[PDB]
Write a protein that binds this ligand. Sequence first.
Ligand code: A1EGW
Ligand code: UDP
Length: 453
Amino acid sequence: SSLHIAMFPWFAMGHLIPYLHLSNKLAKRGHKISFFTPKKTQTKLEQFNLYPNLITFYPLNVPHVDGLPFGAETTSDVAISLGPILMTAMDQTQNQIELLLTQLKPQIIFFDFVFLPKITQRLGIKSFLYFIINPATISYTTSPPRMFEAENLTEVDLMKPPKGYPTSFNLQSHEAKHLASTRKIEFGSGIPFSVRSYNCLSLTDAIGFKGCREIEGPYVDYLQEQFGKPVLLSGPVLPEQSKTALDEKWGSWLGGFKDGSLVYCALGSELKLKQDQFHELLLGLELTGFPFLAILKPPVGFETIEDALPEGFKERVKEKGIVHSGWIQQQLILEHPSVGCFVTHCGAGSITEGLVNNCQMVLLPQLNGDYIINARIMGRHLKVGVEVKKGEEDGLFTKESVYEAVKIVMDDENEIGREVRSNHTKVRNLLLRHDLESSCLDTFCEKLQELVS
Ligand SMILES: O=c1c(O[C@@H]2OC[C@@H](O)[C@H](O)[C@H]2O)c(-c2ccc(O)c(O)c2)oc2cc(O)cc(O)c12
Ligand SMILES: O=c1ccn([C@@H]2O[C@H](COP(=O)(O)OP(=O)(O)O)[C@@H](O)[C@H]2O)c(=O)[nH]1
């Protein structure tokens, strides 16, 4: 039988988009989806609704919280430092979520962050904490062994995996420092960030992750052993086709470059670089001599790209490079044959989009546990990309380190570049295998049926 699933993702494009990708896959299997979305954001989500008779948007009014800029709905509308206030606003949607669940009566609700399971169990609804970040990240930072150390969890503690963690990778000091401090910072309604997610893991009926057994398997198994409840895999949430074609201005411009020659650089929809690293990144792209498209917000303190560019940059780069601040159709650009290289911040969505395409992967993780852990998995486990070197303590890169990573992967004769191309091809062939996502979804849906039995 078909399930009625409500979707309540976090107010971030990187969550709304894969939740919608998955919603389309579920609706293709006949499941009815009630998709909760901030009101104004719905208009930008319609392009992805491929089953409007089965996927219905229900608007949420993102409530005022002091400090939240007026009208803000998504982390793409606020500075990164304001995310915790937006999380308070998500928390404050509880009354309109309660009303929506009582009138719609879904069997399951997929959610982020809102540690909701008390409400759903009162209503006879199953709660499903559905992560679109890597289970390797949640396992590394939010498994019980981490939380029981409470505020005795040090940067040195975070340099090693929690007890029983299934794999090995190295963090730099500044990354472990980042994880040790930001973990404690309130993220909505006075709740420390890692405590919030731990509460969700603890209180939810079941957990799910974007991913497949071949890659995410060991972490989902670890989390299932740790939290003693089902930890499902949706499949890798392969991007679905939008109803909107590639913007002709980008299509025309990209079409003027030789196949595989262009370096696409984008650091997601939330973050702003500081100026010095904005400069180093752009000068590093320039040093390669390849054409490039860099999708970047103006750096901290600046309101336009033009004002922040290194001196003489436009005049030197001429028509071979564009630095652009607006939202673009990233998935469609990564499919364009001109793109030979993706310099990515290693956001989980961007990783999948790179993996399913042909672009060589250059890993520029920004300071966020999921970006960093994605970068280590991609660079050291799957070995599908080359990571730009950062200072051990300062977390900064040089323009030369950017240059060298792009040069390595774009050089047909470079053995490391050939290696990551070959490994990327192996991973792409897995993710796109004719039965991989479908068999993941088969299992996913069977386990969801078990959840509501
Ligand atoms: O990056 C992280 C992340 O996602 C990010 O959390 C921070 C927000 O600002 C971003 O928009 C969001 O993508 C989440 C998260 C996402 C969805 C959830 O339901 C949830 O409980 C946690 O956990 C994390 C835990 C870490 O130890 C480290 C991280 O780096 C993240
Ligand atoms: O200008 C942009 C920036 C981002 N994205 C999409 O937004 C999502 C960003 O998610 P990700 O996890 O990569 O990073 P985040 O933006 O959450 O930091 C991905 O699907 C990108 O394709 C896009 O289409 N256009």
